Design a protein around this ligand. Structure first.
Ligand code: 1WE
Lengths: 283, 338, 233, 233, 58
């Protein structure tokens, strides 16, 4: 009972501190050094900023909501909380997709990598990633678009449980799925399949002239495909079926999402040798 | 004939070595031991000039102690204002491989040249508002490695065909040439009286050249590797010297000796540029290990470090009034230290 | 910017900044290539076909919207150590070699070994060329001069199964050609530890397609560089 | 180098006219451009100022939203359009060259000008002590200039210009920054002061010194002018 | 013979080099520190001049 709750608090606070510290190191290392001003590092820095803002704006309140089934913050802050959730999760996903596109333009059109992937396009990418989720979230959250058609259902669902939920609907749920997880989830798969094929053939050519690709591609794809996929499958299956789901499942799914948020800067920055070299020179 | 002709050469240079040996009584250190040490300088990066595309290869301080000129291999020669960090002129180039720059003592002309084997002359102050080439100088076989201004109409160039040449802009041909270096000379420095100049080739030897008559006067040896940087002493009776064996040495014109050697085993890289201080107490020396240490001129004890460059340091320069020093590097960033 | 003079000064600086960033945009999308080689080798012919003591005879050419710069060496001195470290931003090195002399071959191998081991010229790939194939074929038909006169190892050598002879081409010619090819490639593979790759080729000038060869080689070089940078190789 | 202008004539009030100061013989795209106003029986006055890159545009406090300017870099032509002209707007208009960087000498070159006839505060103010004095060819001549504020700046520059227009041609430059000599003037003029009042001295007097001297200030936008001191021999 | 001509020039250079007079190193060192100490006041690199100087402020 009480010991279980205390262990839950310990785990959640450990996750929060890990998120904040790792993202802060990423931001500081990218921002301070002058040799790390390549535009892909600008994308990584913006993604880190998004994840850090999520960590320092949402996680404690989700902590208190999930720890005890009630909401001692009133109606005014629930809307802000849900909007921030949707905003920053979508921002992280979009940033990862844009990183994949930039990486594809490097090992498939190598003679014109710097002639088109300059800093203007990167600024455009950052602006889009920060902007489109904002309206896409606020429209449903504040303007009351998700709850249309299931007002009484939402009222009985929120009041049969504790704190305010993120209750979706049928058409809004499927639209949110197909807009925020699918179309950013196929670009990565296609790009990395192409890159895997090219790396394989080049390695085989070099070997016949006289491994790493599989490992890196797997560690990049498995982190993103194991966290958001279960939550987005359950969220889209729930309105199509009947709402037969324990509330704790939603808690573990959103915690998997936050775990993806804490894993992202340990995969896209620390996994590479040049960034580790710069960080070690810093200390 | 060849066998006998040489034997007097070995005999005579042996006599020279014996005379050089029996002319010393003490070194500089044992006589300077009774001197209060220098103390930590603690220099700080007051400014950071930027705007270059490729890596800087040289720089030169203007006489006014306010302007400086820098040349990079992207084919550009910018002129900054060291106080307000502005940009006065930005001159394009014809050859994208330039390794020399020189700003005239009056402040009118700028000269630059590289693998093109040509020194160009640019006229900054004209009735026209554009900087235009005045007279291209040709006549060297190899690449030009250094160039200095004796006067407003007498430039001196050091080339890679092992021949130095004094020029004359208004006429446009070599009025004097110098021979005597086996290797390609890669360093040139002018005496404060403008009556002499020394140079250092790759054969690990330096020679003093009399400007007027147009021939050598003295020879200096003592290095193992080639010579990358040379510079006189403010008094005019000494000059430092850089090399590639992590050793920089101080020589004497009057005594024709080797006074003092600056070396510490913790550095293995090579000296790239050497400049003195207006008082003479310090001897700046860039290094390939990305670092720019400061050497005391009288005690050989290091007096501070000026790290902060992300790549090789190529050129240095102390201010004419002696209030600042600027280091250029291969990371395309000029820093006005102090 | 206290007074009007400083305002005008910073205006001039802003214009200079705009010009410099435009020149950087022009500079950042161009690939630069050296053209090291020798004298009897057909440098002049090839450099004319791409289309005074000056030390640089830079030439430009364009294929498929890409821009290449041909920094051909000029009338410098034989010593090649103090102006070689200046070339660290280049993409590849076109090492033209003449293969119709039977005696300059050893000097060519020495030069290639000197280029493939310079400390500054590391992570720089080499696009080796073979030149004057027709002259070599005619010499093989003529006889007289033999490889065994200079290289006795030719006789105890067999053509590789990987050879792809053109129609005609008496296979003695093929054996000799692949002998020189294998010599240069073993010299290349003697070191390098997979950081820069040689790229042999069999050209004869006389308007044969060459710009495509440099294009493909540079594409492969840059693609492998990028694949290695992202820990994908 | 030469500056040429077109236009002029008598215009009825309320009309509009377009005049141009055409430039040919220099780099018109790297020079700031000015305009000055001088009545035939009065002194000189400022009109406008346009920067080289057309990023900074200043106008006289008298006319700010009525006068308009335009420049054409490819043709090196500059245009003025007049809207709702008044009788008082009748003076001599000159187009003046200037370039701004450290060590420069602004207001160095002057044009020829055109004649226009029309049928019938808290800023720094400056004055001239005298207006006409008799002198002789061979003694010393001293002229005093006074301002209402300390022109010394934090950097250390005192802004003072002397022109000394001759009777029949456009003015010139003698001293800028109160101490720096002009380009082609003889070594006979000098200036000095303490921060409040300025004086000009001439060592030797010749037939070329006949004219009227002008005193100038350049600290802020208004760009006030002097009165003038005619010299009769 | 070209080689013997080079030897003649080298011998001439050595003979000329064998003409310069030299002094004791002690006098040279004395001159060095005598110049060094006397002009030690105008060294804004070694002795930090007050804030009035150093136009490189900020
Ligand atoms: C993790 C969020 N509370 C749920 C969500 C919904 C839609 C998109 C992203 C995220």
């Amino acid at each position: 009972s009480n010991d279980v709750r205390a262990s839950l608090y310990s785990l959640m606070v450990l996750i929060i501190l890990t998120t904040l510290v790792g993202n802060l190191i990423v931001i500081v290392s990218i921002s301070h050094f002058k040799q790390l001003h390549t535009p892909t590092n600008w994308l990584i820095h913006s993604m880190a900023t998004v994840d850090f803002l999520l960590g320092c704006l949402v996680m404690p309140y989700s902590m208190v909501r999930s720890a005890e089934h009630c909401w001692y913050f009133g109606e005014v802050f629930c809307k802000i909380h849900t909007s921030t959730d949707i905003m920053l999760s979508s921002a992280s996903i979009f940033h990862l997709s844009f990183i994949s596109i930039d990486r594809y333009y490097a090992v498939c059109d190598p003679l014109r990598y710097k002639a088109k992937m300059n800093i203007l396009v990167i600024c455009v990418m950052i602006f889009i990633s920060w902007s489109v989720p904002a309206v896409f979230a606020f429209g449903m959250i504040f303007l009351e678009l998700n709850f249309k058609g299931a007002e009484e259902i939402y009222y009985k669902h929120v009041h049969c449980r504790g704190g305010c939920s993120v209750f979706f609907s049928k058409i809004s749920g499927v639209l949110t799925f197909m807009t925020s997880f699918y179309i950013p989830g196929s670009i990565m798969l296609c790009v990395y399949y192409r890159i895997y094929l090219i790396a394989k053939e080049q390695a085989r050519l070099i070997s016949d002239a006289n491994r790493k690709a599989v490992k890196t591609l797997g560690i990049v794809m498995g982190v993103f495909l194991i966290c958001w996929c279960p939550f987005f499958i359950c969220t889209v299956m729930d309105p199509f079926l009947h709402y037969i789901i324990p509330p704790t499942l939603n808690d573990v799914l959103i915690w998997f999402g936050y775990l993806n948020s804490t894993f992202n800067p340990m995969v896209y920055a620390f996994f590479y040798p040049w960034f580790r070299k710069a960080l070690k020179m810093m200390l | 004939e060849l066998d006998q002709l040489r034997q007097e050469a070995e005999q005579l240079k042996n006599q020279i070595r014996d005379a050089r040996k029996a002319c010393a009584d003490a070194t500089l250190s044992q006589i300077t031991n009774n001197i209060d040490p220098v103390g930590r300088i603690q220099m700080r990066t007051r400014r950071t000039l930027r705007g270059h595309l490729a890596k800087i290869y040289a720089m030169h301080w203007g006489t006014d102690s306010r302007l400086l000129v820098s040349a990079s291999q992207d084919g550009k020669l910018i002129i900054w204002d060291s106080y307000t960090t502005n940009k006065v002129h930005a001159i394009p180039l014809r050859s994208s491989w330039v390794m020399t720059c020189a700003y005239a003592p009056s402040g009118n002309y700028v000269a630059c040249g590289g693998l093109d084997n040509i020194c160009s002359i640019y006229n900054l102050k004209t009735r026209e508002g554009n900087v235009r080439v005045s007279r291209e100088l040709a006549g060297h076989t190899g690449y030009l490695s250094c160039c200095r201004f004796l006067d407003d109409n007498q430039i001196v160039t050091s080339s890679g065909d092992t021949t130095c040449a004094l020029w004359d802009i208004e006429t446009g041909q070599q009025t004097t040439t110098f021979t005597g270096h086996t290797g390609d000379v890669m360093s040139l420095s002018l005496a404060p009286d403008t009556r002499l100049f020394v140079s250092g080739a790759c054969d690990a030897s330096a020679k003093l050249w009399d400007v007027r008559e147009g021939m050598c006067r003295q020879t200096f040896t003592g290095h193992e590797s080639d010579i990358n940087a040379i510079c006189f002493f403010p008094n005019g009776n000494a000059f430092a010297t850089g090399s590639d064996d992590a050793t920089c040495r101080l020589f004497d014109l009057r005594a024709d000796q080797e006074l003092m050697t600056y070396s510490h085993d913790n550095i293995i890289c090579g000296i790239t540029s050497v400049s003195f201080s207006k008082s003479g107490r310090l001897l700046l020396a860039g290094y390939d290990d990305f670092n720019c240490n400061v050497w005391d001129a009288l005690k050989a004890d290091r007096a501070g470090v000026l790290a902060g460059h992300d790549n090789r340091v190529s050129c240095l320069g102390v201010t004419d009034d002696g209030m600042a020093v600027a280091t250029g590097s291969w990371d395309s960033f000029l820093k006005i230290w102090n | 910017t206290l007074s009007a003079e400083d305002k005008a000064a910073v205006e001039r600086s802003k214009m200079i900044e705009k010009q410099l960033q435009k020149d950087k945009q022009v500079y950042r999308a161009t690939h630069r290539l050296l053209l090291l080689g020798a004298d009897n080798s057909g440098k002049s012919t090839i450099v004319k076909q791409m289309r005074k003591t000056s030390g640089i005879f830079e030439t430009k050419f364009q294929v498929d919207k890409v821009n290449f710069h041909m920094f051909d060496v000029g009338a410098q001195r034989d010593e090649r150590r103090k102006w070689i470290q200046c070339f660290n931003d280049v993409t590849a090195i076109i090492f033209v070699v003449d293969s119709s002399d039977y005696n300059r071959l050893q000097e060519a191998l020495n030069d290639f070994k000197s280029i493939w081991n310079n400390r500054w010229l590391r992570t720089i790939s080499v696009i080796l060329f073979l030149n004057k194939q027709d002259l070599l074929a005619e010499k093989v038909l003529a006889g007289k001069s033999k490889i065994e006169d200079y290289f006795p190892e030719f006789a105890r050598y067999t053509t590789p199964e990987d050879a792809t002879p053109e129609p005609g081409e008496d296979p003695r010619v093929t054996r000799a050609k692949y002998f020189i090819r294998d010599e240069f490639l073993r010299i290349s593979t003697a070191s390098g530890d997979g950081r820069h790759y040689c790229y042999p080729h069999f050209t004869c000038s006389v308007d044969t397609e060459n710009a495509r060869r440099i294009f493909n080689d540079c594409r492969d070089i840059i693609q492998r560089m990028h694949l290695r940078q992202y820990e994908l190789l | 180098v030469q500056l040429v202008e077109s236009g002029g004539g008598l215009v009825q009030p309320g009309g509009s006219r377009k005049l141009s100061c055409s430039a040919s013989g220099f780099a018109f795209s790297s020079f700031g451009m000015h305009w000055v106003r001088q009545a035939p029986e009065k002194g000189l006055e400022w009109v406008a100022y346009i920067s080289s890159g057309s990023g900074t545009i200043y106008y006289a406090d008298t006319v700010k939203g009525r006068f308009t300017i335009s420049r054409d870099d490819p043709k090196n032509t500059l245009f003025l359009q007049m809207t709702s002209l008044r009788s008082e707007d009748t003076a001599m208009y000159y187009c003046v060259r200037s370039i701004y960087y450290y060590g420069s000498s602004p207001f160095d070159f002057w044009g020829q000008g055109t004649t226009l006839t029309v049928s019938s505060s808290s800023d720094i103010v400056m004055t001239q002590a005298t207006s006409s004095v008799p002198v002789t060819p061979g003694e010393s001549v001293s002229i005093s200039c006074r301002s209402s504020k300390s022109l010394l700046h934090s950097n250390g520059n005192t802004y003072l210009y002397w022109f000394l227009q001759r009777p029949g041609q456009s003015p010139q430059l003698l001293i800028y920054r109160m101490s720096n000599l002009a380009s082609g003037v003889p070594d006979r003029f000098s200036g000095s002061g303490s921060g409040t009042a300025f004086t000009l001295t001439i060592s030797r007097l010749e037939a070329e010194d006949v004219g009227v001297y002008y005193c100038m200030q350049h600290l802020e936008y208004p760009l006030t002018f002097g009165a003038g001191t005619k010299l009769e021999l | 013979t070209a080689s013997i001509a080079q030897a003649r020039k080298l011998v001439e250079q050595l003979k000329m080099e064998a003409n310069i007079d030299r002094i004791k190193v002690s006098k040279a060192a004395a001159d060095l520190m005598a110049y060094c100490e006397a002009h030690a006041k105008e060294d804004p690199l070694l002795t930090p001049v007050p804030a009035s100087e150093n136009p490189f402020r900020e």
